[model samples]
Target: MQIPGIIMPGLRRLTIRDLLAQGRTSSNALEYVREEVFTNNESDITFSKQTANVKTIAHWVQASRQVMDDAPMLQSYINNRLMYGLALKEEGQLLNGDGTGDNLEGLNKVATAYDTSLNATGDTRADIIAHAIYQVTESEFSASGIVLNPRDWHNIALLKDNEGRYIFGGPQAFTSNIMWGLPVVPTKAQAAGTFTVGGFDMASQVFDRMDATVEVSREDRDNFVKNMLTILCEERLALAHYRPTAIIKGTFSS
Candidate 1:
């Protein structure tokens, strides 16, 4: 069989892991953190400690040993798939995981919800995000990023004025990925009609046990007998939204 040298692109986008802070962990342990923040009160301050357990995410695929050797590129391709699969899952798990069972406590689950009272009637999608960012500031933290579903970003970017002109520059604009001065991340990881504006770099962190790894072995169940090798990729990590208030989530429909 002839193997093509080209790699077709997939629907993968940047993962939330890159936008937030990074860390390294030694074990499945507590994320020891201290937040000495102003108490939002006169002559008082707040000190706090955080504790959350690290969890592991993993997956594996098996293939005929000859196939990998026959197409050397296939080995690396499969390896990339495994690593990418982990990252893609990380995006979902970072924003949506509910901390149920073995799931990582996700951002959406912990972030404070925006108060609709602060949003005047007829506020646009972009307006909603700006309000969220300001809410974070009131919490004594600065927002550094915004996450939206692609559909919402589409509606936002194409907003038309009375003359049918794009409200935010036009189709030829560059850096539209930014919204209200913060880098905008439009990904399926965030559900449609919902937006999250937060201090991702300041309020949260990803603690990797060893980042992630890829391993190949034939010692797995029935692999040796079938002349197969298993390609596995996995990572042990924890997400800590130490200042959940620093993140404000809101719905566009309201």
Candidate 2:
């Protein structure tokens, strides 16, 4: 006898969440160290209080109770779908949410826009990513992450030298999420044809007031009478952009 497998649509690989610091928080208060000055044991450091409002991301789906009992894969699919769905939205919120109403303020809302005047317009996208690193360094922070749209990442990854050879690596071989010696985050959360470079480790932190959790119940509203189970997944977190200028966003020129 052959066992069956569940085939679900692919989930987009998440990245931005891992690029920044992750932690737990009890309150919405966001206070972080901005600068440290220690001269001969006389310490005078600077701290800034920024706005970080923890927002909830959640959703629920109702299914027949018999569906849950019929297949073990149903359980896995139900749970994973809810979690990944919430995280996908969270990813978008982390990168582009404008902080209006219930939206959590995201990096794009605060990062400095990249500016440049260059002669290397022919190979602008690749060159600009490298130059953005200087934008962060000049602000006294170290740039360690590059956020790019998946297509743009591919466009650069396949770059060829004057001799027409792959500059980064061959199509047959690939490794970690890296580019320019920095962690690269390729995701749909960022708009296609654009990129963001940052000292992410020094620029922002993600605080989880409540980590993702899933639950099911049949007592909600008409669910008890309909023989259906309600599944819910949710999480609450705040993103703190501690050093705004440490992150820079730019568009790729063709």
The best candidate by lDDT is 1
lDDT of 2 by residue, 1-254 (tens): 12113323235355677778888999966675553221223545444555677888888878788766674677777776777777778888888878789988888877878867532546546777888877787667789788888778877788776788777762533424567777788787889976888888767889989767777666777877878788877778888887777888877656
Against the true structure, candidate 1 has what lDDT?
0.75
The candidate 1 region of ten consecutive residues with least summed lDDT is: 1-10
lDDT of 1 at 142: 80
Candidate 2 clash pair list: none
Which candidate number maximizes TM-score? Answer: 1
Q: Identify the runs in model 2 with alpha carbons over 4 angstroms from their true place.
A: 1-14, 32-48, 68-73, 118-121, 170-177, 221-228
Query: Tens-digit lDDT track for model 1 on 1-254?
Result: 22223332345456477777877878777746555454554466566676778887888887788856685577777766877777778777888877899999888888888978888877777777778889898777788888888777877877776688777653444333766666778787889887888888878888878656777776778888878788777678888877877887888774
TM-score of each: 0.83, 0.80
Error of 1 at 241 (Å): 1.7
Candidate 2 overall lDDT versus native:
0.74
